[PDB]
Amino acid sequence: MGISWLDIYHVVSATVPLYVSMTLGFLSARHLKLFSPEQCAGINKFVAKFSIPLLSFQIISENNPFKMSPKLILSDILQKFLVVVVLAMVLRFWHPTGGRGGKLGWVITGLSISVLPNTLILGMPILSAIYGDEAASILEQIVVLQSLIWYTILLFLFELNAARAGTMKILLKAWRKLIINPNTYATLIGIIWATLHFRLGWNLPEMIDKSIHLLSDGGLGMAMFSLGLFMASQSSIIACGTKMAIITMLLKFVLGPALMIASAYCIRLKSTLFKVAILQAALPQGVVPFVFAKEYNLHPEIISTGVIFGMLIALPTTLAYYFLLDL
């Protein structure tokens, strides 16, 4: 496998649908002037509460939880610990804005620009096309972590930052916020049902499965449409300027993949899992962190710029990493 032009063409053909399903939303929100800002928020609200949860359930319910590789989980833990260590070290010698501010604020804006890629909508098709169906069952293990263990911790830290800017009270507030999250319930039920379907042999009734599919189908396309609407909402792609966009992208597409490579070497992962993990780490930034930043107002411009430009540059960077890892 020399990465001939045929493979790159196949990846491009697999990724074009989810880019033309996004340019449509961008044009509708910006050029065609089809949706009002409140109307745009209506679509953005429906998708994140009906398609992302149902899509997450339909993606996580089709995996034997007992087959989850502990090595990949430990590699994820090690990566998201090393990134924290490096962020703490760098923030001790170079404040990004100069003027002193909450260190935890800059460590929470970090860990959202570095080690929380988009692994449901914009990250599943690309990796599946690049590495076939083998890699589609590996992201299905990292998505579970990102939805259960990492986003809950990020929410708790966001609440802590909002309060600081009793610990038990903060934990209780984070719990209340989490209980009303459709995605956490969807992924929890997905794993609980996958356990049953793979151990006891239970199968979803035709009615239930088809009802779930009706809304799950098109979840990727409409999620990309909503992401395009979000891009159209912003006045300019580079919200904070060149200085904080180059650094954002350098972090996301170097310190993430590089730290994942270091973690894999420490854990000594294997082929068909090392490359998948690295590409996952190299995926564009996720959206949920942007939602948290907007809700708690923690540098929304930086995270929005990172998300938008990383999503735009997904194909170049992802193809570059795919070519590099095959040497």
Ligand X SMILES: CCCCC/C=C\C/C=C\CCCCCCCC(=O)OC[C@H](COP(=O)([O-])OCC[N+](C)(C)C)OC(=O)CCCCCCC/C=C/C/C=C\CCCCC
Which residues make up the interface to ligand E7O (CB under 6 A)?
A: 47-48, 52, 118-121, 143, 146-147, 183, 223, 226-227, 286-288
Does 7 participate in binding a copy of itself (rule CB under 8 A)? no
Does 151 show up as a binding residue in the annotation? yes
Among 126, 144, 151, 163, residue whose Cα is nearest residue 279: 126
CA 239 – CA 236 distance, rounded (Å): 6
Residues 197 to 256: which contact a copy of itself by CB under 8 A?
A: 206-207, 210-211, 213-222, 224-225
From 41, 85, 172, 320, residue interacting with a copy of itself (rule: CB under 8 A): 41
Nearest-approach distance from CB 27 to a copy of itself, in angstroms: 11
| 118 has binding-site annotation | yes
Q: How far apart are CA 50 and CA 274, in angstroms?
A: 33
Residue 298 touches which of ligand E7O, a copy of itself, ligand X, none (Cβ within 5-8 Å per kind): none
Among ligand E7O, a copy of itself, ligand X, none, the one that 221 touches (CB under a kind-dependent 5 to 8 A) is a copy of itself
Closer residue to a copy of itself (CB): 106 or 225: 225
Q: Is 288 annotated as a binding residue?
A: yes
186 binds, among ligand E7O, a copy of itself, ligand X, none (CB under 5 to 8 A by kind): ligand X
Residue ranges that bind ligand X, judged by CB under 6 A: 32-34, 49-50, 53-54, 57, 179-180, 182, 185-186, 189, 193, 204, 208, 212
Q: Which residue of this chain has its Cβ atom nearest to ligand X in the complex?
A: 182
What minimum distance in Å lies between the beta carbon of 230 and a copy of itself? 14
Q: With respect to ligand X, which residue has the nearer C-beta, 49 or 71?
A: 49
Kindly state the tokens that stand for 191: 């794993």
What whole-number distance in Å separates Cα of residue 86 and Cα of residue 143? Answer: 24
Q: How far is the CB of 318 from a copy of itself (least distance, A)?
A: 17
Name the minimum Å distance from CB 23 to a copy of itself: 10
Q: Output 55 or 281, the one with its CB closest to ligand X.
A: 55
Mapping DSSP onto H, E and C, the string for the chain reads CCCCHHHHHHHHHHHHHHHHHHHHHHHHHHCCCCCCHHHHHHHHHHHHHHHHHHHHHHHHCCCCHHHCCHHHHHHHHHHHHHHHHHHHHHHCCCCCCCCCCCHHHHHHHCCCCCCCECCCCCCHHHHHHHHHHHHHHHHHHHHHHHHHHHHHHHHHHHHHHHHHCCHHHHHHHHHHHHHCCHHHHHHHHHHHHHHHHHHCCCCCCHHHHHHHHHHHCCHHHHHHHHHHHHHHHCCCCCCCCHHHHHHHHHHHHHHHHHHHHHHHHHHCCCCCCHHHHHHHHCCCECCHHHHHHHHHCCCHHHHHHHHHHHHHCHHHHHHHHHHHHCC
**Residue 21 binds to a copy of itself (criterion: CB under 8 A):** yes
Q: Pick the stretch among 36-44, 112-120, 172-180, 232-240 that binds a copy of itself (CB under 8 A).
A: 36-44
Could you list the residues that contact a copy of itself (CB under 8 A)?
Answer: 13-14, 16-18, 20-21, 24, 28, 34-36, 38-43, 45-46, 49-51, 206-207, 210-211, 213-222, 224-225
